[PDB]
Amino acid sequence: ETVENVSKESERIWRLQRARTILEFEKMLPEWLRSRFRMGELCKVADEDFRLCLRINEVKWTEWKTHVSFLNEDPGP
Amino acid sequence: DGLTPLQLAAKMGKAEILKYILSREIKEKPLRSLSRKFTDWAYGPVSSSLYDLTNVDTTTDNSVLEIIVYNTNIDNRHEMLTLEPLHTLLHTKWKKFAKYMFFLSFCFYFFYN
Amino acid sequence: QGDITAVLIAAGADVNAHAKGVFFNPKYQHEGFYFGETPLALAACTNQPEIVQLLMENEQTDITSQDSRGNNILHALVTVAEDFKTQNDFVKRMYDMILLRSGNWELETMRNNDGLTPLQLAAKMGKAEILKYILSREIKEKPLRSLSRKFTDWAYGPVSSSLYDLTNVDTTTDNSVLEIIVYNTNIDNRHEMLTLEPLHTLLHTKWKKFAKYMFFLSFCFYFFYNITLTLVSYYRPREDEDLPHPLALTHKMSWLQLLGRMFVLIWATCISVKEGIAIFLLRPSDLQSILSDAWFHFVFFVQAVLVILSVFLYLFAYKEYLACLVLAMALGWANMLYYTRGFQSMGMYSVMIQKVILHDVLKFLFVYILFLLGFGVALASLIEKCSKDKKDCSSYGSFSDAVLELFKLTIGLGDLNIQQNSTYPILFLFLLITYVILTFVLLLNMLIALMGETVENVSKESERIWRLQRARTILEFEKMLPEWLRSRFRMGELCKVADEDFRLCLRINEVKWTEWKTHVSFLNEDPGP
Amino acid sequence: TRGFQSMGMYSVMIQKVILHDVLKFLFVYILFLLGFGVALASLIEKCSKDKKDCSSYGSFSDAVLELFKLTIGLGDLNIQQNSTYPILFLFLLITYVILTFVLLLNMLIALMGETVENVSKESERIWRLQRARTILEFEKMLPEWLRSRFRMGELCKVADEDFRLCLRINEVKWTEWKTHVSFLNEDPGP
Ligand SMILES: NCCOB(c1ccccc1)c1ccccc1
Ligand SMILES: NCCOB(c1ccccc1)c1ccccc1
Ligand SMILES: NCCOB(c1ccccc1)c1ccccc1
Ligand SMILES: NCCOB(c1ccccc1)c1ccccc1
């Protein structure tokens, strides 16, 4: 299974052995100026405007549905 | 042990239940406050998804990535980091932050040798 | 909402609207969804066949309408339709539906603000699956089979002859389909597009009638070219004339022993002018094709110029008279890898050379330098610091000689005489054995590094890169072919439906068996005298 | 080497590579040979050489052969004794061995591509045809007298003649039973 296992496991060991470095660098990063990611705090339902921290993605095609979700726009200025 | 069930699903490494907890989209309106995935907007086959991401990011004590990636016991850490709230968050820590420190800590320890 | 939509049209909504907002987005993947901004295309883009069935029955609907980008509706379906197979694939089903609902041929002749027909836009965007429809498009009707691109010559049981309308397809107009498929670099699946029947047999016929014989001709010229540089410089028949000059044209030379020296000077200048024009053309291709193709334009040009600069160096007589010649001769034999295209497995081996040298040698070399320089410092204790027993009497370079005598082992050109020390040769060789075993494991993993779907991917992608890197040569040869006497392919101009006898240029095929049907197509015969 | 089931199946793989794919590799291996050989033959007869033009002959040819002996591994150091260009000699000649390793490493991958199936199985099926042609050739070699051999007993078919036709007996097997109405209902007989 070098067609699969010796190649793929050596890839997945590597991604874990790089993702451990990245969280190690945040311990190395000083607490001041983590002015970074963790996107804008939009509403959830409730009365507070900023409810929670967020993360934005870009999902895609077929299996449409007539959506009833949220602010019906494009993301805004 | 002091663990939330999201953290307990990560420490025990149960991947499939953790694909639900980090997504959890709820298409209702008495109780869509319990949902972890939201929507920014939807316009045909292009749509923007929003993740509630409270204990997920490395900003509190013993976060989810803190207890997935530093964990050694479980087998399928790679099957868990493929998931969308963990993945693009790891990519964004990579691109904005960790790529440039790694090349910086390269050129120091390479000029060292 | 289909029910609410018909109310709004009955209430008088503008069906020919245009939404010119910032959702066009060159940064496409976020906030985008370009759909050509008309209400007709939006139902056409988002799998709404009944609303398209509703909107195109409205007589006020401008189906021929354009966009801010100049796009009509068939441009809009092209710019959306993904190269995913059968996503209950609606766009090809609905591209089919719009032309058959309405329209003359005067809808795919419409160009955008780039000047592209929707066949060309499907090729430039590289949407393969919609382009398998446009180039086939057989229509088994008789109000509107004039819109069809595939026809039939005749049908007789399970043997039947197919005819392709082939207007903008062939390289006979400006910016044709093969012009914009094969020279394209942006899209991924150029090989998935050239497998298609109007493009394939047309590329085969340009290969067999035309490009095979020029390629062997341009082989035997550029192969006799490199023999001549070998037989001029490094021949020396008997006792040469006191360090001569290779490309010199001295007073008495029989006309077999200097015409080859003219043969170099002509065919180097013939190449130097040729890709010198490719400086004026290939401005964005070289950086975008950062590893794939068009490097061989450069390596031909660098080889041709350094021959000529060696002649310019003779007129000034600097020190690098011989230096610029030999790198021009060494690239000249290395340039034969461009002529390793042509045999179906030969370039398929040559692409695997180009894959490993570009991608994965620098992978292995960076690790192999690393254990070299790692054990080399470990070895250079045992030079200049250790016993050495007789040494500091040979040449130079304490660290450098310790590296090289550890670096000659990978050749196998191994020296024992560098190792004569005092009681540390126990510790020398068991160090140096752990070099060879460690540089065996770097070698053994290097074979496994190419492994990983070698049963499929390393073989098949090296084949499909080769077919694209040969199909780019063939269209390059037609630019090389002069405009007079292209009396060639592009078969006879038979009728379509209309009153003109010669309607369009054609291409004949030989389709086959089961799933019969009682045919109503064309002239019911065999092809004719 | 026909005759053992895996022996010719190895021997056909010899006949496949020597006919098809050696001339593949040899045309590229001559190419980097003749490519670096001109690059090496600056460092013979044009460069330092420090003691040379006293040995045998052949300025370009000796520079080729001493670069051509490395593929054996029969490598000579004494051909390389020059002046300060042996820095540039060996790092040229290393880039010969690495380049003629990649030609060697891709040569293993050149036989790869469905070696799990096609290179093994086709070399088996070519062998079975190339052994079955021998066997019918031996019957042309066998003289016509005493072919008292196979072609089993001539049992009836339906008709009035007892010996109807020549035969061949097999031993077919299990499930999908049926209540048979075929022939002489026995075991084959004394
Ligand atoms: N587009 C993802 C880029 O980040 B991924 C990544 C790439 C290199 C090193 C570390 C992480 C990744 C993260 C989670 C799952 C899979 C891949
Ligand atoms: N305080 C220790 C810093 O060392 B660094 C380091 C730490 C662990 C492993 C390798 C290197 C470092 C990190 C980034 C850039 C430069 C150096
Ligand atoms: N019978 C096809 C021969 O031409 B094909 C071809 C063969 C060698 C080099 C270039 C092209 C071909 C053309 C299109 C798709 C696939 C193969
Ligand atoms: N005017 C330049 C002609 O060079 B030819 C050429 C052009 C590009 C790459 C290689 C060779 C050529 C073509 C066919 C036959 C012989 C030579």
Swiss-Prot record, chain B:
Chain positions of ANK repeats: 1-23, 59-81
Tissue distribution of the protein: Expressed in keratinocytes and hair follicles.
Location within or outside the cell: Cell membrane; Cytoplasm; Lysosome
Superkingdom of origin organism: Eukaryota
Transmembrane segments: 92-113
Protein purpose: Non-selective calcium permeant cation channel. It is activated by innocuous (warm) temperatures and shows an increased response at noxious temperatures greater than 39 degrees Celsius. Activation exhibits an outward rectification. The channel pore can dilate to provide permeability to larger cations. May associate with TRPV1 and may modulate its activity. Is a negative regulator of hair growth and cycling: TRPV3-coupled signaling suppresses keratinocyte proliferation in hair follicles and induces apoptosis and premature hair follicle regression (catagen).
Subunit structure: Homotetramer. May convert from a homotetramer to a homopentamer to allow pore dilation. Interacts with TRPV1; may form a heteromeric channel with TRPV1. Interacts with SNX11; this interaction promotes TRPV3 trafficking from the cell membrane to lysosome for degradation.
Family, similarity comment: Belongs to the transient receptor (TC 1.A.4) family. TrpV subfamily. TRPV3 sub-subfamily.
UniProt name for this protein: Transient receptor potential cation channel subfamily V member 3
Organism annotation: Mus musculus
Gene from which this protein is expressed: Trpv3
Shown residues in whole-protein numbering: 340 to 452 of 791
Swiss-Prot record, chain C:
Encoding gene (name): Trpv3
Main location group: membrane
Function: Non-selective calcium permeant cation channel. It is activated by innocuous (warm) temperatures and shows an increased response at noxious temperatures greater than 39 degrees Celsius. Activation exhibits an outward rectification. The channel pore can dilate to provide permeability to larger cations. May associate with TRPV1 and may modulate its activity. Is a negative regulator of hair growth and cycling: TRPV3-coupled signaling suppresses keratinocyte proliferation in hair follicles and induces apoptosis and premature hair follicle regression (catagen).
Entry GO CC: cytoplasm; lysosome; membrane; plasma membrane; receptor complex
Places the protein is found: Cell membrane; Cytoplasm; Lysosome
Residues of the full protein shown: 227 to 755 of 791
Listed name of the protein: Transient receptor potential cation channel subfamily V member 3
Superkingdom as given in the UniProt entry: Eukaryota
ANK repeat locations: 35-65, 72-104, 114-136, 172-194
